[PDB]
Amino acid sequence: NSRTRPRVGHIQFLSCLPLYWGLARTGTLLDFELTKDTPEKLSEQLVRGDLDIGPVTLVEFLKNADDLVAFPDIAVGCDGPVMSCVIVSQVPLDRLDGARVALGSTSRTSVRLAQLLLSERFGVQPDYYTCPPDLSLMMQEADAAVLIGDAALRANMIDGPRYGLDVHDLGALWKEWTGLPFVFAVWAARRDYAEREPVITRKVHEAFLASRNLSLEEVEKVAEQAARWEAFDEDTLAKYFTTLDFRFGAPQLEAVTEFARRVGPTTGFPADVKVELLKPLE
């Protein structure tokens, strides 16, 4: 009946590879029982109780906000381009009305942001369908596709330029539309776990912040090492890691508030949903 390590999720994509570096170098990993997977699986596992703490794609957090406690000061976001959330299209976006648009199944938030932009900014109503993320296949059978993660970064930096495909950065489209930054995923504890183990939850939160901070300082070391295992080179990875925005304070919460209000009534949660933050000790 001894104390057991928290079950902690971790996004397998490159976006959170520097964070993984920090968790390893600080020794934090030895205080976790870590699960690596794609964002939609990690969100399903946390909501279903197979994890205690982990990253949650924003839309799924909002649909479950009464049962989750978000960690302050860490998130996966951007202020302008995010580079790894894109619309790849063979035509201008305003020509997508009634066209087929493939939505990568690993996404919940970026697909909704893309749908919001296309309808409310560009005024087109495509015929959406979900499918596994595969740019080559998606382009054969759809006129445009929404991708996240490594596949999106690959479409943005490699596939797009080679084949003359338009690649629209969803963070940039949102920044153009609203002037706001964007948050794609947060870290959260299950409410029942945070109330049963307040101290473990706090130490996990603080360890994430320290590991994140360390990864910011050693971004070039992380990029050099990771470049040996990717089609991206060191400069591209370092640019990607430094373009991503892992803050989660008042300006980022303002962005979440506005996004939630615009998509709630079309996504399945109240437009004024409450985001509960983990409170520090007095």
Asked whether 249 and 79 are in contact (CB, 8 A), the reply is no
**196 lines the binding site for its own copies (CB under 8 A):** no
CB nearer to its own copies: give 4 or 130.
4
**137 lines the binding site for its own copies (CB under 8 A):** no
Binds 156: which of ligand RDH, its own copies, none (CB < 5-8 Å by kind):
none
* 101: number of Cβ within 10 Å: 22
CB of 159 to its own copies, least distance (A): 10
**91 lines the binding site for its own copies (CB under 8 A):** no
- Indicate the DSSP class of residue 90: S
Binds 174: which of its own copies, ligand RDH, none (CB < 5-8 Å by kind):
none
CB of 3 to its own copies, least distance (A): 6
- Residue of 22, 54, 81, 149 interacting with ligand RDH (CB under 6 A): 149
The Cβ-side half-sphere exposure at 261, using a 13 Å CA radius, reads 7
Helices (H), 80-218: 109-116, 135-141, 149-154, 160-163, 170-178, 191-196, 198-217
**268 lines the binding site for its own copies (CB under 8 A):** no
* 282: number of Cβ within 10 Å: 3
- Residue of 44, 97, 166, 230 interacting with its own copies (CB under 8 A): 230
Report the DSSP pairing between strands 166-169 and 85-89.
antiparallel
CB of 281 to ligand RDH, least distance (A): 30
Helices (H), the chain: 17-25, 39-48, 58-63, 109-116, 135-141, 149-154, 160-163, 170-178, 191-196, 198-217, 219-227, 234-243, 250-267
**115 lines the binding site for ligand RDH (CB under 6 A):** no
Binding mask 178-207 toward ligand RDH (x if CB under 6 A, else -) reads ------xx----------------------
Binding site for its own copies (CB under 8 A): 1-5, 17, 20-21, 23-25, 27, 29-31, 154, 222, 225-226, 228-231
